[model samples]
Target: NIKTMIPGVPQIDAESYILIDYNSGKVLAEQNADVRRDPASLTKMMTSYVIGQAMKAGKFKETDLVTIGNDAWATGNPVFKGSSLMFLKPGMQVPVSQLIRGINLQSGNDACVAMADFAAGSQDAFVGLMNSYVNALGLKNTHFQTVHGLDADGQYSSARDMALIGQALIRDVPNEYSIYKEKEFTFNGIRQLNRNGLLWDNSLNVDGIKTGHTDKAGYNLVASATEGQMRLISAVMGGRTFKGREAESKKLLTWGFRFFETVNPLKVGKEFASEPVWFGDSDRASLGVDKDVYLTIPRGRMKDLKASYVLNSSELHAPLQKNQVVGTINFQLDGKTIEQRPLVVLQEIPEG
Candidate 1:
């Protein structure tokens, strides 16, 4: 039941899109958010995820060399007609940092396969890792048959999931993931401009991310932008045309930044619990959080936030222990306490 439009960017044939607040996990804006559709090159986002995780776990370092085999050189279709390539001959060794920048910046399919093959020792093996990541990361509705998100039956994702994945990238690889947002990266004397055309456009505060396209998948993009302390991940999949996807993606991101805003109903330091009686004791008890809560309110709606606690009226008598969940701290946004948490005693108590 939520909807709005931005004037400059017009929506086209994209079947699905979404805008999310990464900090709070709130859906600021959505359209067919759950619709499963071809992710196109957006699969690179997941590729980046796996790559970052491996690096964080000390699997490899940025300076480490990744050798390109015959498989990666021959993976994609012939239709690109010399779109972009890493130009690595079989048995050619490339730096991990260079491979990452190649794929993220230029959407080089060749770079994607090379990273996968190097990571898993074979394309098939690397794909297994990709699938494992899908499961391990709780992708739920997302599945990756290929590391680069190439054409595959049922290889799809929802806008919500895409945003979630974007958040994961930001959280998991804050330092190394900047490659994805780079407007352009020059390597080996060859200069490549990022395909994300919007980054060059001064329409909004948009920054580095990714774009994808295929005959079956249409034009697709997962984008992020910031204004002050606020950042948003926006996506559109199955665009009818390149221009269409860009327009719609830009529109969605703009509307989200323009209208919705974050409002913390309760400060994090604010306490909200008491450990109720455990057995027969009373008075002394420990506490626990009532619930996990964050609010994404409409701009200027912060004044509508309300906080209240509901406690068990009578004295809780028992062998009270610490960390017990006693009652709840309810938060209301605009006359609606949208979230409620447990209130518990702070210390253990014995029977009277």
Candidate 2:
């Protein structure tokens, strides 16, 4: 028996915020998380990801030089002029890696435009690519009109959506995601630093994520960190300042880690049950989950997690193949079912 008295989170100052378990994608705490707000520079996460996917598709190599179109030149293009820049000049020959680094550390609008045009041929087309991914991710509260999150009209993303983006970046594009940890990027002999303050925190393994700000959007920071086996993604938006955003994000993460934990409650491919095989060479066949099962639950509840099984048939007449569903597994917490999955054959059972 368990009654998890999860204490309330601290008084978070942001207008919108969400904390999620990285493994299970469970929300631990949130406030106005689904409300759309201008993302400021947070839109770069999508831009970075689209280019990362294009790289995966063999579209181009990281070492390949991308010409800085006049539309993306730092000092020339009004779309990016005087905003965050990679200090790119028109026709400047910059490698893809350099631009990515710029985007990661400098939060460069210039770098974003360059990669958008380089990867998708135009800024508008690049936004089309981004929205397609948004659809793929099943996000309903996000739209991209600018690649750099420059507070443009009709460009917005919710705190929940931003955290999911952070989660997807780590899950799908780890190599590119690693760039966010770097503290500084120097291009054209000008050094720009990462705007994410949590990157410098020593309390936990806080890694790569994007930070955003604008007069209309306030301050936004999507921070990801790992404490032991549990990783958390926190999105705090509309804070009044950088310090407040980091403080609120850190507060959410700290509270989440203190109260909840992730666990692999069920081991896959290790037979948890067996059934009588009437026509098989063996009298029984083993059943298990084909993939590891992860769950986010309140702390101190591991001992209460248990599993029950229900076979599809009283007796199996097999030639059962590996991975065939023979039953159902209902995982419970303290006698209450929390999740269910197919009970699959761990190994083939051949008929006599």
Please give each candidate's TM-score. 0.83, 0.90
Best of the candidates, TM-score: 2
Q: How accurate is candidate 1 locally (lDDT)?
A: 0.72
* CA lDDT of each prediction against the hidden true structure: 0.72, 0.85
Which ranges of candidate 1 are over 4 A from the true structure?
Answer: 1-13, 74-83, 265-270, 273-293, 311-328, 340-352
lDDT of predicted model 2: 0.85
Q: Which candidate is the best by lDDT?
A: 2
Tens-place lDDT per residue, model 1, 148-267, is 765467688877788788888887888656776677777778888888888876878777578887787777788888876678888777777755657788777777777877755544
Instruction: Give the CA lDDT, 0 to 100, for residue 326 in model 1.
Output: 61
lDDT of each residue in 310-348, candidate 2, tens digit only: 988877778999999888899887668877888999889
Error of 1 at 10 (Å): 8.6
